[PDB]
Amino acid sequence: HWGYGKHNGPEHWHKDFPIAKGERQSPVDIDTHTAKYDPSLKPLSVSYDQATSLRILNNGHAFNVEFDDSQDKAVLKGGPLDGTYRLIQFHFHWGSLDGQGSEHTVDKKKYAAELHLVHWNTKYGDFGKAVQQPDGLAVLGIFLKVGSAKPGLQKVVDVLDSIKTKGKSADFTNFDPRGLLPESLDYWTYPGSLTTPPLLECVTWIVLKEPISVSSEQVLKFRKLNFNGEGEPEELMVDNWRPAQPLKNRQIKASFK
Template sequence: MINRTYEPFAMGSFQDQPKIAELINNGDTIFLELQYDNGEPYISGGPLEGKFLLEHIYFHWLGNDTFESVNHTNSVFFPAELHLAFRNDKYPTYFEAARVNNGIAMLAYHYKVTEFDKNIYYEFMKALEDVIKPGAVAKIRGPLKLWDLISYDIHDYYTYTGTLTTMLCDEDVTWIEFNDPIEISENQVDIFRKLKAYDMSPMIYSQHHMLPLSNRTVFNAFILEDPDSGIPIYHSAVPFVDNLVGVAATWKPAEIQICIGIFSVLITTLITSARYIIA
């Protein structure tokens, strides 16, 4: 693995609410289709050359929590993965983009099993239970933003040129694999394992087995911090404040609301304690 410096990612419309969100069991895997009023989400920067538009989202999972998946990080294996397929906007269709270099970018996120359910996945899991059989389609009724599905640390990743894991297998795909896993519960992973394939067999091992790297070069990403790039860099006289601001810059709205709530409770408790002492 070779260290390489990249520009930060620019992500657009990841916070937009889609007008339609549907899960589709096509007999091979589960697709999440999102439709937007004002244009689909896009990504640029990092190892990408140009602007890439969201095409589709699909999932891979295993029959247990220890088997190897398509991709791995430092020999740590995960029970499921989320793949976001993006098309270079220079090409009018996904299939045209898939046949050229720098045409397709795949963002890969790993799922890690934890004790508690991931609440923001609640409506997604409800719809997933409605697409057990092949050919089934279910709408996600509650709010579902793309940003809520993924992990927030978009700076810690590695990248390489590889193949698609569904449909075409051209070796011209830019893979971007994020190291920060998405935490979901064992119960939520088990819902994936209830899904049926086109022949009504359990839809497990819903992926190609891990492919050898061959002569591919894997790059470990370092983010370029250029004072002239226009990207704001916050500094204060207290290092703790610098760290807090830096982390907060990547927080999602839900996480910010939780922090505000915690601080509000702390402030209220301090005020109440002060009044009690004064009295």
């Protein structure tokens, strides 16, 4: 099955998931000079005061911090979106070295990592139905650069030792995702897809302009995770990012001037 190695990596995904070559794939390069300021975009509304984290899971491609999405606790609204999108999980993509790891790029620049806060449109009733719809998901993407530590990330990095291998999970309650946000909510937006199989074309992407800073030590601990299961030959979980895909007939809009 699919992964990030030579033999099962992004260049192979199209054979099981033909939509890999579709018309609205993600990630993309954000060309800052071509993205047009759209004065009709609203401020995003990130309402995470009542967020309820439950568990952290190594799923063999990344680790997901999962939320209680059984009612409207943590939601994303506004910006390019109509309606209410419930936070279900967040995860990251990162590199083997600081010079690569993000999925989106900004004028071809790759960041050390990228955080994805994944939300589903509650008008579809459940996540499985939402991913079948062109406006089913909203993913808030946040770049990570290496510099100063991010205090709000430390609880995540401290639990990684306990979910080293694929299929391990740990209790992860009372985590506040507001501690992973940058100061500004200025963003770019475009229609796209999940960036892992099944690559469904169901996502309104909202990518924040301001990266967060994390420390070298913090990102080093991401790279000690394993793609493999317990007792299997060790394959460090690094470079779990899909490269930029063709923009095709899409426009990336800026919320800021």
